């Protein structure tokens, strides 16, 4: 009956599960104003992957496939393939291909391509707007804005590598991207399917605990805050361990190994998210060597000490 645990890793040793960048800090705030339903970094404590969540930190927000030029323009349509270059199956019971961005925004990166016959290669600046009418990865189509109108070839392996986010157009400072707004994965005016559920604190005085990174900015004044429910290493670890849950809630203590002292305690829910006892927006002040430790399976009778 395998014992549950969480990785012995500091926040800084870990990775954001919604963009391929490292974690930086811990944040808690009220989330009643918006719907918190990220599709990446969703995994149960007994190791069931949810939403669009997959194992590879480096595949998060990447796309692969072949491209078709949109005539006269610097825009290309990518016909998606799966992450191993095999055919993509739209009938799978997932919201979108695993690793698809789970927020509405403009993601800048690079499209790279290799020509199968002679091994010639090319790379170009590329931006995908995930709020676009033509953003339909569930259907196997996404559109990229590039800096070339001729260089990419048809029927050759093409990859998108994400770098950062931009705000352009007339959008006002830091009002894009919208990290808590899900894309419409099948394109405009279609409902999303097979989603990991929204999360909220239910107990009074409790707030979600967020694992926070700063996405790189490539242009303008973007909102670069990125919050995930679980670090990517926890997803990989729970998936690997697949330790049975003995109750709904795993009690975690954040421990400073230098002193042996407990900074605070929190609840890791079986469905894969964390809550703390705090009211208000707060950037947690944590020791550099601090890490999370699983201490026991509890229930609603256990009340968290104020953070």
């Amino acid at each position: 009956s395998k014992p549950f645990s969480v990785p012995v890793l500091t926040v800084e040793e870990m990775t954001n599960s919604r963009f391929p960048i490292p974690l930086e800090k811990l944040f808690t705030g009220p989330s009643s104003a918006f719907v918190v339903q990220p599709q990446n970094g969703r995994c149960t404590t007994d190791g069931v992957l949810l939403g669009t969540t997959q194992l590879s930190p480096v595949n998060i927000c990447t796309f692969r496939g072949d491209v078709t030029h949109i005539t006269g323009s610097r825009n290309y349509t990518m016909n998606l393939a799966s992450q191993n270059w095999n055919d993509y199956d739209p009938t799978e019971e997932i919201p979108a291909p695993l690793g698809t961005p789970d927020f509405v925004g403009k993601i800048q990166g690079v499209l790279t391509q290799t020509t199968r016959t002679d091994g010639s290669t090319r790379g170009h600046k590329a931006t995908v707007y995930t709020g676009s009418a033509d953003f339909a990865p569930k259907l196997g189509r996404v559109q990229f804005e590039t800096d070339t109108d001729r260089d990419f070839e048809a029927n050759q392996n093409t990859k998108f590598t994400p770098v950062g986010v931009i705000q352009d157009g007339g959008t006002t400072h830091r009002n894009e991207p919208q990290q808590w707004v899900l894309p419409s994965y099948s394109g405009r005016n279609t409902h999303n399917v097979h989603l990991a559920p929204a999360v909220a604190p239910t107990f009074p005085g409790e707030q979600l605990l967020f694992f926070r990174s700063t996405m790189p900015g490539c242009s303008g004044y973007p909102n670069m805050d990125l919050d995930c429910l679980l670090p990517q290493e926890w997803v990989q670890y729970f998936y690997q361990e697949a330790a049975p849950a003995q109750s709904d809630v795993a009690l975690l203590r954040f421990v400073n190994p230098d002193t042996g002292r407990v900074l605070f305690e929190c609840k890791l829910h079986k469905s894969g998210y964390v809550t703390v006892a705090h009211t208000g927006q707060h950037d947690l002040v944590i020791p550099p060597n601090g890490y999370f430790r699983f201490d026991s399976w509890v229930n609603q009778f256990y009340t968290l000490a104020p953070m």
Partner: nanobody
Amino acid sequence: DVQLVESGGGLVLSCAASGSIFSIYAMGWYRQQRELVASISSGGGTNYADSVKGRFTISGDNAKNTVYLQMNSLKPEDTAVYYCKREDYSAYAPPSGSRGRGTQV
């Protein structure tokens, strides 16, 4: 097994725990539909029902493995049977619950 050594309230509390007890736990009082009154957790967290909030106080002595409930400004709506409750928690097994027989107040 865990056994609970209570104490009583009369007319218009303490609960003491012994046995196969664990380092991580919660203890408190329910009353009778059956309703929560107050609980306290080993990490220091406390929870109160809205009706007794601000009037009744719960506290605990970890060494004796006992919890104390101070009932103040008692009202007719407080009349019920009050039973101590404890949850023992481990990293390897589901929570183990123990309940007192109950005391009329």
